[PDB]
């Protein structure tokens, strides 16, 4: 009746136990229902196939603005925060995004309240209020959102490409919008934005352009009736789907060179080729076949040779989405100092590789290898988190038939050499666009992009250059990839051992290593997680050694890259990085060949031979990387400073780059043996693996280090952990700095409570749960201080507390007063809330903390967190939630009155103020809720001095976990 059709069988992975049913309502809405009787959280998402590409020419950002407004009230639920408040009280969350052709809304919530959430949600598409008052406030949120992107290099380049194509093509539009485009200019032009928002919603939010996906515990039949009851009423305007057959880049936009000045000190080369829309060929993906080859990093690849010449370090190639009717094919690389001088040669090599592909012709075995790999990946796919899953599905329901939505973007079908040749025929010099990003162009540009202010220059590429590229011949160093030897073949799930444990067990406890093990007893997929922490005091003893630890590992990954790329493609991955206590190594994926890769890594780090050239290149990139932190956002600087302030030992970026210039090859080579001579290893092996196999992996790691590095055990007294500074009662310190790039302020306020413990943890978490929603609605929605407004707990070195983070055009001291006013408002709010409401929050937190991992790596991460923090409280959630339910409203009031209130006897407050670029100075104190009077803070002028003048907290005691 209200249903036009019900899908046949929804092809899913055999390992997938969830149930699916696809349907199309009478109004044209495509739906995918998902029943998962085990899910702790239910979720829904609706994707409207309309985006910024459809913004009216005179109101840039209208669709994005519409997106923001839909969260602030509907005819059925007028309360501007009814939606967010409801979700918050029921362990839910929500967000939405706007792209060129889509506006996607989504939320998740306790499985028991799917109906209530979905009802409030459906109203976004039935009776939005677009309240005048909300409109005038929320426009500030949009402006602030754009403001933080202004000095972001990725966004600047994004808009620059649009501004350099056909000006008449909608691809040229500014999609974010700001106060000028959404308020100032419209007012001047006599345009009523409120009307336009309604007109836009009325004209494009049509049921025929919508797709919905719902996931819950309810049966498919019940979910079917629920969806019909709430969405069949959406009106169908029979809106035509926007199409863009003419490519934004026409002839006059090809064979062009762009020289661009970046904000950060980065060096990049972007090569772009216009191509037809390849979306309809998804069954064979000719564009991805070419991306796979051109972007390959194995021996014989384009990258391998460009790196050998010392011209580039990284490369990305393949097709890039555009919109219905047009796409792009790119080849992007970063540049070394030398690579910057050889851009013409680099591009020549690009065409030589492309010519090599043309000469050999399409390779079916390559396609087949990927097809089979994709089949394996789809079959053993990890179970997704509901929210992201529904959002993703709502989006692709627009491109594939109901029955194929789950497989469409995973499985390959037919090899189409003709389509591959057709795309390859478009990758030629005559149709190339080249952009070079480098500080070396500063003062050499003559154009400015209006929306971001990007400085650049445009030149036609000389015909003789085009002609030399067209004559690209074959380069003996370029070869097609060899057969991938890492493809997994053994997928058997070993039977659960009789002595298997529900939590990780300590099966090895020696001075050289401590091994935690757990055989997967929930997911049963042929995968495993091998986590290793290598302790050594020489990884962070001083700035120079921190630099060497980083450089060492970076050089190792770089030398293993060719080898490891193939493994990565075969679903075998690894992460290796230096830490403040040593090194971290993690190998994840199919268990089959993990031992081979792991052995190779350990063997290599212990017998590593540094390439001088690679060493100099990576050192130079690292130097810029440290310097580039100055271009990060204000709130990031704020977080950075707080971290340096509150931790016993922490080397600053400045100390690191100062010590860097003295890292020499000889010094680095001497460093490695020292680093590996003495270590302690704590590991967590979790997955499709046996106790005896675990012991075997650990022994192999030990034996390899002992054999090549002569590694010996470390002394237990050497296993030092850092402490957090202990603030004095009623103390308040302020550290102030300035961000030289962004013209916006940032701030982080930290109210230190006490050492982590069951009671203290839940006191803090319950309070945060309670203020979470009100904090966002007050400081952002109501007061519009900025797009970024955050509150929540802060945990570090066993200590904890409450933190607020804000980025705004308003000065820090004003921001501080607002947070303080809000605290008092939350005070009255809590004292006035009903036991009913209070218990909702307890239950909300309970569900949040008990929501269980849906994939192996998520469960492992939780165990790893306990091991890394050395608290080893694996049954933490049950414990803490049991305690949580004990908490009363009064306990919270007392906790607030003793630790957080402005006149609390145990208030421990530190504030980091980051001033905007255009602020030469600023004080540190100064129809809105009334802000309380604040004490005079002690200004921190030197971080070292600050820490020295305060005591340090002790380290948290470990939760004893008995085992051999």
């Amino acid at each position: 009746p209200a249903i036009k059709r019900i899908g046949n069988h929804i092809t899913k992975s055999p390992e997938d136990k969830r149930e699916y049913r696809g349907l199309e309502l009478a109004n044209g809405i495509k739906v995918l229902l998902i029943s998962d009787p085990t899910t702790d959280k239910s979720s829904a998402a609706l994707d409207v196939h309309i985006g910024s590409l459809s913004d009216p020419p005179n109101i840039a950002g209208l669709s994005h603005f519409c997106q923001h407004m839909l969260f602030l009230g509907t005819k059925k639920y007028p309360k501007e925060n009814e939606y967010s408040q409801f979700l918050s009280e029921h362990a839910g969350s929500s967000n939405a995004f706007t792209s060129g052709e889509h506006t996607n809304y989504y939320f998740d919530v306790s499985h028991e309240h799917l109906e209530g959430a979905l009802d409030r949600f459906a109203q976004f598409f039935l009776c939005p209020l677009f309240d005048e008052s909300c409109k005038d406030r929320e426009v500030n949120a949009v402006d602030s959102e754009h403001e933080k992107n202004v000095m972001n290099d990725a966004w600047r380049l994004f808009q620059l490409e649009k501004a350099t194509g056909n000006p008449k093509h909608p691809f040229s539009k500014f999609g974010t919008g700001n106060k000028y485009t959404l308020e100032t200019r419209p007012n001047q032009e006599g345009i009523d934005v409120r009307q336009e928002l309604l007109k836009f919603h009325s004209a494009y939010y049509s049921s025929n352009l919508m797709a919905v996906c719902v996931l819950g515990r309810e049966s498919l039949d019940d979910l079917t009736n629920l969806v019909v009851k709430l969405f069949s009423e959406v009106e169908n305007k029979n809106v035509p789907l926007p199409e863009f057959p003419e490519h934004p880049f026409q002839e006059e936009h090809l064979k062009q060179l762009y020289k661009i000045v970046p904000i950060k000190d980065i060096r990049n080369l972007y090569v772009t080729f216009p191509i037809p829309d390849l979306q309809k060929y998804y069954k064979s993906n000719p564009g991805h076949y070419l991306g796979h080859l051109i972007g390959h990093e194995g021996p014989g690849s384009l990258l391998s040779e460009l790196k050998s010449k010392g011209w580039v370090n990284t490369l990305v190639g393949g097709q890039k989405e555009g919109a219905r009717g047009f796409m792009f094919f790119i080849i992007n690389v970063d540049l070394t100092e030398e690579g910057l001088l050889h851009v013409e040669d680099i591009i020549l090599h690009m065409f030589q590789y492309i010519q090599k592909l043309r000469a050999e012709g399409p390779q079916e075995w390559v396609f087949q290898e990927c097809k089979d790999l994709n089949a394996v990946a789809f079959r053993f796919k990890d179970k997704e988190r509901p929210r992201g899953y529904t959002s993703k599905i709502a989006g692709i329901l627009h491109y594939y038939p109901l029955e194929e939505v789950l497989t469409a973007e995973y499985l390959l079908e037919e090899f189409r050499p003709d389509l591959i040749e057709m795309v390859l025929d478009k990758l030629r010099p005559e149709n190339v666009r080249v952009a070079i990003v480098s500080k070396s162009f500063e003062g050499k540009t003559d154009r400015t992009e209006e929306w971001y202010g990007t400085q650049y220059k445009q030149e036609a590429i000389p015909d003789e250059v085009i002609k030399k590229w067209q004559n690209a011949d074959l380069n003996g160093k370029f070869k097609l990839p060899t057969k991938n030897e890492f493809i997994p073949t053994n997928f058997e799930i070993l039977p659960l051992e009789k002595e298997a444990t529900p939590y990780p067990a300590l099966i090895k406890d020696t001075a050289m290593s401590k091994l935690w093990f757990k055989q997967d007893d929930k997911f049963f997929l042929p995968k495993a997680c091998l986590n290793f922490e290598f302790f050594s005091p020489f990884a962070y003893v001083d700035p120079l050694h921190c630099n060497m630890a980083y450089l060492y590992l970076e050089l190792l990954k770089d030398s293993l890259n060719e080898y490891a790329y193939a493994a990565e493609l075969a679903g075998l991955s690894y992460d290796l990085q230096n830490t403040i206590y040593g090194m971290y190594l993690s190998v994840k994926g199919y268990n089959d060949k993990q031992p081979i890769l792991l052995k190779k890594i350990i063997e290599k780090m212990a017998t590593f031979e540094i390439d001088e050239k690679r060493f100099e290149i990576i050192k130079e990139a690292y130097m810029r990387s440290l310097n580039n932190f100055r271009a990060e956002q204000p709130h990031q600087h704020a977080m950075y400073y707080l971290r340096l302030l509150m931790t016993e030992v922490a080397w600053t970026k400045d100390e690191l780059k100062e010590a860097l210039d003295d890292v020499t090859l000889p010094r680095l080579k001497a460093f490695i043996p020292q680093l590996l001579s003495r270590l302690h290893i704590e590991a967590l092996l979790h997955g499709n693996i046996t106790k005896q196999a675990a012991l075997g992996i650990m022994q192999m790691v030990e034996d390899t280090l002992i054999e090549h590095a002569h590694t010996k055990p470390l002394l237990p007294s050497q296993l030092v952990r850092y402490r957090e500074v202990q603030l004095p009662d009623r103390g308040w310190f302020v550290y102030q700095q300035r961000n030289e790039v962004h013209n916006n302020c940032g701030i982080e306020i930290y109210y230190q409570t006490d050492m982590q413990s069951t009671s203290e943890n839940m006191f803090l978490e319950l309070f945060c749960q309670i203020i979470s929603e009100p904090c966002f609605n007050t400081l952002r929605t109501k007061e519009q201080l900025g797009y970024i407004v955050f509150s929540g707990p802060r945990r570090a070195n066993g200590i904890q507390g409450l933190r607020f983070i804000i980025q705004s055009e308003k000065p820090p001291h004003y921001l501080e007063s607002r947070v303080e006013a809000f605290l008092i408002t939350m005070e009255k709010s809590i004292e006035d809330m009903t036991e009913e409401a209070f218990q909702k929050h307890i239950q909300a937190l309970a569900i949040r903390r008990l929501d269980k991992p849906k994939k192996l790596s998520a469960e492992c991460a939780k165990y790893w967190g306990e091991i890394i923090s050395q608290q080893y409280n694996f049954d933490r959630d049950n414990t803490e939630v049991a305690y949580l339910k004990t908490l009363t409203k009064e306990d919270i009031i007392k906790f607030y009155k003793e630790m957080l209130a402005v006149d609390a006897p145990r208030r421990h407050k530190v504030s980091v103020h980051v001033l905007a670029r255009e602020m030469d100075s600023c004080p540190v104190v100064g129809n809105l809720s009334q802000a309380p009077a604040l004490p005079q803070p002690e200004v921190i002028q030197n971080m070292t001095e600050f820490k020295r003048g305060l005591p340090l907290f002790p380290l948290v005691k470990p939760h004893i976990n008995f085992m051999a």
């Binding site: 967000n95 995004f97 991306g291 490369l315 890039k320 797009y787």
Partner: peptide, 11 residues
Amino acid sequence: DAEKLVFFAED
């Protein structure tokens, strides 16, 4: 290897 969205809130 082988190969911008505006949100309501930064997550």
